[PDB]
Amino acid sequence: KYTSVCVGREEDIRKSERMTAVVHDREVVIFYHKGEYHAMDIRCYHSGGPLHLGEIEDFNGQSCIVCPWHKYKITLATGEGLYQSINPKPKWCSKGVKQRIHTVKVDNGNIYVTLSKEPFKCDSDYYATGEFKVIQ
Numbered sequence: 001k002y003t004s005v006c007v008g009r010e011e012d013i014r015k016s017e018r019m020t021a022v023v024h025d026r027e028v029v030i031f032y033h034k035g036e037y038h039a040m041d042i043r044c045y046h047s048g049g050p051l052h053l054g055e056i057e058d059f060n061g062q063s064c065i066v067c068p069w070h071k072y073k074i075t076l077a078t079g080e081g082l083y084q085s086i087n088p089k090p091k092w093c094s095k096g097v098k099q100r101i102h103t104v105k106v107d108n109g110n111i112y113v114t115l116s117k118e119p120f121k122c123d124s125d126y127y128a129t130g131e132f133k134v135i136q
């Protein structure tokens with residue numbers, strides 16, 4: 001189950017700058033930002049919050065989705081949890097890929113999503129499949 005699902009129209013996403021889709025039983029959010037498309041698992045790796053309801057902002061020169069529940073910052077391009085480490089000048093830090101990023105292509109003004117296999121495991125996978133509870 002790893003080839004293109006057409007998730008909709010280029011025109012339909014440019015307006016709102018985000019849309020959700022179900023791709024081979026995996027629910028994803030697609031963001032269109034600064035002329036680029038980014039797809040990831042819809043439920044936040046931290047506790048399962050609705051990333052499609054978060055705000056997009058730049059931190060350390062990287063575009064991030066901010067989960068609306070506990071304001072975790074996830075890079076659009078790599079699914080990295082980002083934070084500043086402060087010693088009571090703040091420095092930006094990562095814990096690697098937390099949020100599974102899928103592949104997006106446009107062709108003929110259609111948005112196509114392909115589920116990713118890389119990396120082998122993401123913290124968001126727990127909230128992406130089967131039996132779970134979500135915590136706010």
Ligand code: FES
Nearest residue numbers: 044047049067070
């Ligand atoms: S569930 Fe997203 S930051 Fe806690």
